[PDB]
mmCIF file of C-alpha atoms in Angstrom:
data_model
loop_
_atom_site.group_PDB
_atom_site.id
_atom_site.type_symbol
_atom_site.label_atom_id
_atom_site.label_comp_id
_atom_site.label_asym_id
_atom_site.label_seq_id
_atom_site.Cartn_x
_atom_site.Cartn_y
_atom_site.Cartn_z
ATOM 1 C CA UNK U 1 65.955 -177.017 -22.444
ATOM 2 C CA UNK U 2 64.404 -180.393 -21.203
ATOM 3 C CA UNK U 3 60.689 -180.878 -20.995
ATOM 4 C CA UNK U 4 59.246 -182.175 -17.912
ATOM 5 C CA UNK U 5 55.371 -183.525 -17.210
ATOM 6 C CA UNK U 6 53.575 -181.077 -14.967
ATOM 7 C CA UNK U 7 50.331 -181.246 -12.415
ATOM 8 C CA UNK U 8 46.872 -179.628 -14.077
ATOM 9 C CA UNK U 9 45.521 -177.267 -10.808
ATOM 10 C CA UNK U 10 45.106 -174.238 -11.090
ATOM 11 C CA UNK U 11 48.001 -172.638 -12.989
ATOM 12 C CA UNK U 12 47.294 -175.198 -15.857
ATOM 13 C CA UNK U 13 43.908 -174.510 -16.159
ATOM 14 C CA UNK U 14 44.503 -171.221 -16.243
ATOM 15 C CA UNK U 15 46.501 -171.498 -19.283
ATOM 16 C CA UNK U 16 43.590 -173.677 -20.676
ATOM 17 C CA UNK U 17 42.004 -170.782 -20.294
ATOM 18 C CA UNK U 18 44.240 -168.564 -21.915
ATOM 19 C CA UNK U 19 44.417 -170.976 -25.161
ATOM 20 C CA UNK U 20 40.684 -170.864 -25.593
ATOM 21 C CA UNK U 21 40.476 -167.084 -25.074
ATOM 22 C CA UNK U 22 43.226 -166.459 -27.782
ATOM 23 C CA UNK U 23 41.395 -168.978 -30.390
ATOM 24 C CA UNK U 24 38.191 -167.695 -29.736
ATOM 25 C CA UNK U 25 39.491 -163.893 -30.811
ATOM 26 C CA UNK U 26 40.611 -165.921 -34.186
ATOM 27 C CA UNK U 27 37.709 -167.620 -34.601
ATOM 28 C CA UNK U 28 39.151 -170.719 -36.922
ATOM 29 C CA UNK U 29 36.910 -173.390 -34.616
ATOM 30 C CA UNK U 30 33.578 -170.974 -34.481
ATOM 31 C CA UNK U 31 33.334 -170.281 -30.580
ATOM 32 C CA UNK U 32 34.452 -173.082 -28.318
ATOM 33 C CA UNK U 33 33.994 -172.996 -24.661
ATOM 34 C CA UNK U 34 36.554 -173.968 -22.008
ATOM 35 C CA UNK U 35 35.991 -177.179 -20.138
ATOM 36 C CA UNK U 36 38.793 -178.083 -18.587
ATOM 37 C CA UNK U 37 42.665 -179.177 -18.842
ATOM 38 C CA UNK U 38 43.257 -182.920 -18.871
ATOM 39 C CA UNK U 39 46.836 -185.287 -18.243
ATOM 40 C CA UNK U 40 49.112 -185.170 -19.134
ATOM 41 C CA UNK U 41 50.290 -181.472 -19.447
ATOM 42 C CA UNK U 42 54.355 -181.194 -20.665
ATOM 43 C CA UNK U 43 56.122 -177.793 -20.071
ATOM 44 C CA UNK U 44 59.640 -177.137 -21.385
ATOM 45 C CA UNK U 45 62.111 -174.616 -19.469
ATOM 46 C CA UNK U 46 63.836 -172.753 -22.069
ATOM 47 C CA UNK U 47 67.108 -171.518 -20.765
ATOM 48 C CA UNK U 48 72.200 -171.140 -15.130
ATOM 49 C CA UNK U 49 69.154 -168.753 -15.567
ATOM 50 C CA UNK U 50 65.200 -169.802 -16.982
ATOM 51 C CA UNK U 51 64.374 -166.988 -19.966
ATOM 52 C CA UNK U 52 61.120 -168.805 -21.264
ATOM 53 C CA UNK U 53 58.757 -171.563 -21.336
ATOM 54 C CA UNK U 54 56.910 -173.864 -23.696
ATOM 55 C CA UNK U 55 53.342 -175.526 -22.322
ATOM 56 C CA UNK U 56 51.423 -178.150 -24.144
ATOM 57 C CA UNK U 57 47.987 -178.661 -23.291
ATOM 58 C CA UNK U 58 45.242 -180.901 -24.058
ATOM 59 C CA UNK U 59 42.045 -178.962 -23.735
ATOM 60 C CA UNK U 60 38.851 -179.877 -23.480
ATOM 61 C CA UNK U 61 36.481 -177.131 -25.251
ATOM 62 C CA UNK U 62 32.794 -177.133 -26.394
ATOM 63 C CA UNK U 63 32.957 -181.659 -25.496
ATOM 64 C CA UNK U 64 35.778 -181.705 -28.166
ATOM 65 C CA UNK U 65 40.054 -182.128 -27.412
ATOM 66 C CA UNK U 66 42.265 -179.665 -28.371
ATOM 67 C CA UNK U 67 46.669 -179.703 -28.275
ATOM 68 C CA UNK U 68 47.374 -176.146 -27.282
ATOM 69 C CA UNK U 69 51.222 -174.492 -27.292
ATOM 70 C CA UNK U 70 51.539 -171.880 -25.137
ATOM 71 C CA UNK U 71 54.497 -169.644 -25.014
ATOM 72 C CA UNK U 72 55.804 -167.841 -22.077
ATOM 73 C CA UNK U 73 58.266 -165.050 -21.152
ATOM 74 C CA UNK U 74 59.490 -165.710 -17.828
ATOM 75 C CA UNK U 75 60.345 -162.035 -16.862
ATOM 76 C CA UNK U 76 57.125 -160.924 -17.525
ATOM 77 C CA UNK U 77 54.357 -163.510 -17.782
ATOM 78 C CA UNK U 78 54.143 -162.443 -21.212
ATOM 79 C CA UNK U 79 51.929 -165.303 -23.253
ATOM 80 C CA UNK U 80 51.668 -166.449 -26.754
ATOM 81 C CA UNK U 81 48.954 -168.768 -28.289
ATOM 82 C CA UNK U 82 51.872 -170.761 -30.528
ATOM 83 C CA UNK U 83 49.461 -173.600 -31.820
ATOM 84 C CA UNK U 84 45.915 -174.756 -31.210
ATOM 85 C CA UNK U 85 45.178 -177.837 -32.900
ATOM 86 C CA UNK U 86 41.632 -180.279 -33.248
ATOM 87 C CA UNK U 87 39.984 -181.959 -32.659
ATOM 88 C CA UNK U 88 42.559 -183.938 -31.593
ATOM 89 C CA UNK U 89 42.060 -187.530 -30.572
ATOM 90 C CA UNK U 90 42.920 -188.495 -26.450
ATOM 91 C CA UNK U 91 46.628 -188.889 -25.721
ATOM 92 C CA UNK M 1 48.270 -193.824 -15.080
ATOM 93 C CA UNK M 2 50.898 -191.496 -14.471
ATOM 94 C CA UNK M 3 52.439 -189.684 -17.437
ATOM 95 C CA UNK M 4 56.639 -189.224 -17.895
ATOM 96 C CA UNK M 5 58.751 -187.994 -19.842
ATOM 97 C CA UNK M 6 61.215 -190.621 -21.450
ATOM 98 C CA UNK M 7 64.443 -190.393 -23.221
ATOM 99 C CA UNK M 8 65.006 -190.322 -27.091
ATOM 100 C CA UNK M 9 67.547 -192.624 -27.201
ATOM 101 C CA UNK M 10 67.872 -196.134 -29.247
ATOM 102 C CA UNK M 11 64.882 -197.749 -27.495
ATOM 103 C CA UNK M 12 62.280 -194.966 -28.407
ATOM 104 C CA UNK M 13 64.272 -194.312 -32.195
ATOM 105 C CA UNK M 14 63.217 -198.214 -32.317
ATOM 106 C CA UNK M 15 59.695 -197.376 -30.927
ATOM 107 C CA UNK M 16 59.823 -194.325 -33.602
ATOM 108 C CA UNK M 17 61.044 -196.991 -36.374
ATOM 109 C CA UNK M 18 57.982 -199.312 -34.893
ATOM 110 C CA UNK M 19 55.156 -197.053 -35.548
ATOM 111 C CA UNK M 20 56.478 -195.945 -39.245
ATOM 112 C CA UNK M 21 56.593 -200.173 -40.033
ATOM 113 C CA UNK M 22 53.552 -200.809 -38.661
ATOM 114 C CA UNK M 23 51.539 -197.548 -40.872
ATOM 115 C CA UNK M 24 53.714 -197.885 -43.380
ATOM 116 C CA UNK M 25 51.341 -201.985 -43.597
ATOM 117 C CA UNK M 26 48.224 -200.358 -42.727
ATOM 118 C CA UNK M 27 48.588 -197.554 -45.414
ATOM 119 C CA UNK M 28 46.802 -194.448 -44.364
ATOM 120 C CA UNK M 29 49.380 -192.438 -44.974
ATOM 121 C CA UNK M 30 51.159 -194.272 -48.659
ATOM 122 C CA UNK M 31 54.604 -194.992 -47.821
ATOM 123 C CA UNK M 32 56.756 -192.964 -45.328
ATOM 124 C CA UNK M 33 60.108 -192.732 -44.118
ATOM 125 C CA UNK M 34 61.270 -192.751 -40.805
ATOM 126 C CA UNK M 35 63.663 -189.709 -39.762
ATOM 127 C CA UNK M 36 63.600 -189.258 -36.457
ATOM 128 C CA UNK M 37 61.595 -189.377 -32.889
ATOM 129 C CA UNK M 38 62.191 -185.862 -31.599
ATOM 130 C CA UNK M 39 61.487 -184.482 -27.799
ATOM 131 C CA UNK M 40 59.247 -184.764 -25.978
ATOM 132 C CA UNK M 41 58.628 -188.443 -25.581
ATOM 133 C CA UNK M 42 55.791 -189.182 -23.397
ATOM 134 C CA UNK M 43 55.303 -192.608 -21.524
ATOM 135 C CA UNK M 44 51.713 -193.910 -19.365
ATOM 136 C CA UNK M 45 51.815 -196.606 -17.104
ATOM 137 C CA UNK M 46 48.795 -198.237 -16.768
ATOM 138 C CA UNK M 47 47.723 -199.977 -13.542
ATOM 139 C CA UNK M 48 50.515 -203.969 -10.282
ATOM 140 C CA UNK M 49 51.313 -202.816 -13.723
ATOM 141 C CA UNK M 50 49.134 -203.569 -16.641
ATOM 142 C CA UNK M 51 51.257 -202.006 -19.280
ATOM 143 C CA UNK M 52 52.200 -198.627 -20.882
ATOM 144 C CA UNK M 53 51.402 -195.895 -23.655
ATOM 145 C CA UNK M 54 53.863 -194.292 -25.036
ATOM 146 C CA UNK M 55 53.203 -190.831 -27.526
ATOM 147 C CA UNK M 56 55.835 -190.135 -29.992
ATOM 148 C CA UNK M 57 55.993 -187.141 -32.022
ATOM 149 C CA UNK M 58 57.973 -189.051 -35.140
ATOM 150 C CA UNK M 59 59.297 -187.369 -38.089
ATOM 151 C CA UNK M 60 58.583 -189.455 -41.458
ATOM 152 C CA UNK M 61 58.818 -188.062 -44.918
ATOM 153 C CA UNK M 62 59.936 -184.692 -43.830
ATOM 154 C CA UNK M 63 56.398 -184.458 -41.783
ATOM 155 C CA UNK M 64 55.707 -184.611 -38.268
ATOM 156 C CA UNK M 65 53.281 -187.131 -36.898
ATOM 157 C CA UNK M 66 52.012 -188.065 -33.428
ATOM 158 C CA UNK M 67 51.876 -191.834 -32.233
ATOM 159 C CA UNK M 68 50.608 -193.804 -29.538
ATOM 160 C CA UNK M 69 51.368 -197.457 -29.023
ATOM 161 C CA UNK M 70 50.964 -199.878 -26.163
ATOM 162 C CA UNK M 71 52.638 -202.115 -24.741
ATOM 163 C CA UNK M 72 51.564 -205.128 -22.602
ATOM 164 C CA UNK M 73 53.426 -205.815 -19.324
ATOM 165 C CA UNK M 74 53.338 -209.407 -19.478
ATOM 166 C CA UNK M 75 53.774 -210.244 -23.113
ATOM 167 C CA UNK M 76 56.146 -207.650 -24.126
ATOM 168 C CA UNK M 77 53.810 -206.953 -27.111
ATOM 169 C CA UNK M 78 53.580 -203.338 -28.862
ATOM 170 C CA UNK M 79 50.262 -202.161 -31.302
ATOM 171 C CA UNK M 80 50.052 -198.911 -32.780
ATOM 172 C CA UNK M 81 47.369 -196.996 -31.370
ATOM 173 C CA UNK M 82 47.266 -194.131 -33.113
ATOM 174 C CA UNK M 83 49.000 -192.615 -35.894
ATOM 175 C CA UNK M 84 47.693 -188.798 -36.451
ATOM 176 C CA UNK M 85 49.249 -186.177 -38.687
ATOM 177 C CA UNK M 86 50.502 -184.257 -40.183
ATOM 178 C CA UNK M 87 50.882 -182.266 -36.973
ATOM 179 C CA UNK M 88 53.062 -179.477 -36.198
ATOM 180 C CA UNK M 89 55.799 -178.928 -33.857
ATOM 181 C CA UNK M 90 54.967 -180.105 -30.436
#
């Protein structure tokens, strides 16, 4: 679809959340904690009728910045962990 | 600074073309080609208007990198900021 540049309340940091939970079950970056979701934050509406969408994140974890993909089914709030990449230098 | 999302057209292919001549004379990276700028295309303004940052995800020798170059308001000059990759699909 089209991406568009989103807010970072609650809903993105949530998802912040979600990106650092899912890495920290891999492990790849030892065990990073969640600081918080910084600008700018892009979401793509994957399509008359929205089926999915596509979040990038910059994350702050454990003082470092991370660029996060997060999948999502609309239908079901069903969420992937597509990417997690770092540490990543600011946007 | 607020962040938008810009356009792919001529102007940021340019932008795109841009980043690949100016790392292709700093040489971190050997020579690469420029293919294409793909979506999304991310513009900052900075703050009266100071000038902006733009972040490109460009594709050069089949690879995809991320780039950030500013842009002065009142001299209308670019630098590359950053050039950082390989990175994968944004």
């Amino acid at each position: 679809g089209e991406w568009e540049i989103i807010d970072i309340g609650p809903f993105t940091q949530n998802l912040g959340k979600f990106a650092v939970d899912e890495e920290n079950k891999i492990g790849q970056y030892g065990r990073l904690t969640f600081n918080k979701v910084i600008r700018p934050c892009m979401k793509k509406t994957i399509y008359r009728e929205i089926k999915g969408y596509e979040y990038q994140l910059y994350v702050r974890a454990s003082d470092k910045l991370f660029r996060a993909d997060i999948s999502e089914d609309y239908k079901t709030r069903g969420r992937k962990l597509l990417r997690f990449n770092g540490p990543v230098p600011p946007p």
